[PDB]
Amino acid sequence: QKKENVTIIRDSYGVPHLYAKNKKDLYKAYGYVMAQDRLFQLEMFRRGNEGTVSEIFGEEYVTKDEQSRRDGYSDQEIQTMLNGLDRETKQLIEQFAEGITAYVNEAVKAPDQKLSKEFHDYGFLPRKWKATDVVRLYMVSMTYFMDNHQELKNAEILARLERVYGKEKAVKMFDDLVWKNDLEAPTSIQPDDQT
């Protein structure tokens, strides 16, 4: 256990348990402990979203950075998103970023003890964080589970099938490959359970 205004108890697995008097203090401590534990990971996840990984890891990541920038958002666009949130919520995201930044500032001042090996080996320093960067950390991972181009693959499947087999056969085959609705597919709820 160790105390800003937030008591942090690290258990025997190193998990931090944060005891705060209010949410503003809590969310700053949350960002701080996450940066203490994971700063290089956070930095690289952010670079993934910004399309700046190739600054560190070279040409092998250029096309990935290009895709990220192609489909991503500017800082101003993200700031507009934050400005549309409830005031308190935006402020807590800002506090979280301030906590990450507090650790960054500590680490750059004592890099040999507080900056992890990957920064030393790759020869660069972590930058400070803003609330927009927190949104970037959300987007880099969550959007992966939502984003796909299967419509384009489907169009290509159908077109290739049609050019060899003709339209009527291609349509039947495609309907078996990508069905409209398989009524026998197992479901998590039943129709009569719907609210």
């Binding site: 348990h17 990984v53 090996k117 984003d147 419509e151 489907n154």
Partner: protein, 526 residues
């Protein structure tokens, strides 16, 4: 990702239960971050994805929550009609429109020397341009139903953390704009399931499995009310299980229906829950173990294989033996005695039988598109079309008659057995395959390196990257969890590893767990 929620009537203790199992791969430092958050009126313990200012898998004072990816239809591709005289113009609502253009500079590390490369990116009214078909005077743009609402989704998740009852949690769920399944269990015994996300109202003139013409006649017309999203509070069955399967019978997801077919991996969780009466967290862990090691094609395909071989076992002694071995096999690829080999030798036969069968079913018709169709017909969630063909159930195209299907099953058996006889011998114990292992590596699903990884090998498991098991007792959430590889990713400049870098790998590999801590008196001694 998998999840289960158990209502009071199905729980041995009469307390609602929750199980989490998000599948986000295995990396060091881990994809998840575990924390305890405690301020006035807000007490919560669990994990979220790295960088998220909220818990996704865990419990507050009032409710436990988890999530699985929804696979709902939140991305559409628009086929833009390009001006043959100007490829930066597209036809939309009666007029040529100009694409928004953006130049982006990328600094690249070479060798050391840094170089600058430039790329130009385009947007239309529908979204970023992702693909060109210049030959066809077409560009493809991408519309996300959640475009510009990602921060609203963060806020919704924070509100779910702060929620104290079904009403507040459902309000938060109604504000989330991306496609997830959310699961809820509370101390009053309630459970709830929501397929969250903002689902657009599409044109009824288009086939939603393919790109939408972008000329303006087929635009989205807003987003459906959350009341039309699949959802249930206290469903009659008394539980909800999910492994990314379909929410409800008439819910559609367009181009990605390939994940929601008759043959679906959630069957492992259905089987386990239906085989039991009232359940406790130990039962849920046994179900997770089965799912984690199941050879998923066994559920529907092992009976079909047995039925075929049984017809010919009086002439072919090898088939009688295979039937006996297949019948006694528990359908798992597991290593209970930790000798480095899967325990059932017939599982190696079955794996090869399946690979041979899949190829014989489709190579002659789909070989010319297999770079795109194999990922459908041999999908990790199920092989519905193959099942329908082999079982003789109705299909739109007549892939194979029953006679041709049976010949495929037999040829695949003969080939698989011949190879095993040639290389290992005739007794099934000689066929046992070496276990496949995995490490917690340096590169996650975001496809860029974020650390140095770990070289410690553990058996591959079709399992969540973390697991929580939570019982909502009257006093507080109780239970157990594991969040490999460990909490702390820091490596000192000199190479010294945090003692908490990989100290949960053994728990994960050995089906052991650490206590879920909620009461501060427990935290201080944990």
């Amino acid at each position: 990702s998998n999840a289960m929620i158990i209502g009071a009537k199905k729980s041995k203790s009469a307390n609602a239960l929750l199980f989490s199992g998000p599948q986000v791969g295995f990396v060091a430092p881990g994809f998840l971050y575990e924390v305890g958050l405690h301020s006035p009126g807000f007490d919560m313990e669990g994990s979220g994805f790295i960088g998220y200012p909220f818990i996704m898998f865990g419990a507050n004072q009032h409710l436990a929550l988890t999530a699985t990816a929804g696979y709902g239809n939140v991305t559409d591709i628009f086929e833009e009609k390009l001006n043959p005289a100007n490829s930066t113009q597209y036809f939309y609502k009666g007029k040529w429109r100009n694409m928004e253009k953006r130049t982006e500079t990328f600094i690249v590390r070479g060798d050391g020397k840094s170089k600058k490369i430039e790329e130009t990116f385009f947007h239309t009214v529908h979204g970023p341009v992702i693909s060109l078909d210049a030959a066809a005077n077409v560009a493809y743009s991408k519309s996300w139903s959640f475009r510009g609402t990602e921060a609203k989704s963060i806020q919704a998740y924070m509100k779910a953390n702060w929620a104290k009852n079904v009403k507040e949690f459902q309000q938060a769920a109604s504000e989330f704009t991306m496609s997830l399944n959310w699961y809820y269990a509370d101390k009053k015994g309630n459970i709830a399931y929501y397929h969250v996300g903002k689902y657009p109202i599409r044109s009824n003139q288009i086939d939603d499995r393919f790109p939408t013409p972008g000329t303006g006649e087929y635009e989205w017309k807003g987003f459906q009310s959350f009341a039309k999203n699949p959802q249930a509070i206290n469903p009659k069955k008394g539980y909800v299980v999910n492994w990314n399967n379909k929410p409800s019978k008439y819910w559609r997801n367009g181009e990605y229906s390939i994940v929601w077919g008759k043959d679906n991996r959630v069957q492992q969780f259905i089987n386990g829950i239906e085989a039991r009466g009232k359940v406790d967290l130990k039962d849920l862990n046994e179900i997770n173990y089965t799912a984690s090691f199941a050879q998923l094609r066994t559920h529907y395909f092992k009976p079909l294989l047995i039925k075929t071989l049984e017809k010919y076992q009086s002439e072919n002694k090898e088939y009688a033996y295979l039937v006996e071995q297949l019948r006694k096999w528990n359908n798992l690829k597991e290593d209970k005695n930790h000798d480095g080999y899967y325990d059932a030798g017939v599982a190696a036969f079955f794996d090869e039988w399946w690979n041979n069968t899949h190829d014989k079913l489709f190579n002659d018709s789909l070989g010319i598109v297999s770079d795109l169709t194999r990922e459908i017909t041999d999908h990790r969630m199920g092989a519905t079309l193959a099942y329908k063909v082999l079982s003789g159930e109705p299909t739109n195209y007549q892939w194979k008659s029953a006679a041709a299907a049976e010949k495929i099953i037999l040829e695949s058996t003969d080939e698989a057995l011949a190879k095993l006889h040639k290389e290992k011998g005739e007794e099934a114990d000689k066929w046992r395959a070496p276990i496949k292992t995995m490490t917690f590596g340096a590169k996650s699903l975001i496809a860029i390196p974020h650390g140095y990884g770990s070289k410690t090998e553990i058996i591959e498991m079709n399992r969540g990257s973390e697991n929580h098991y939570i019982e909502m007792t009257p006093k507080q959430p109780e239970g157990f969890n594991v969040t490999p590889p460990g909490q702390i990713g820091f490596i000192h400049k000199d190479g010294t590893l945090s003692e908490h870098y990989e100290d949960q790998l053994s728990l994960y590999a050995n089906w052991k767990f650490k206590p879920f801590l909620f009461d501060k008196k427990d935290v201080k001694r944990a």
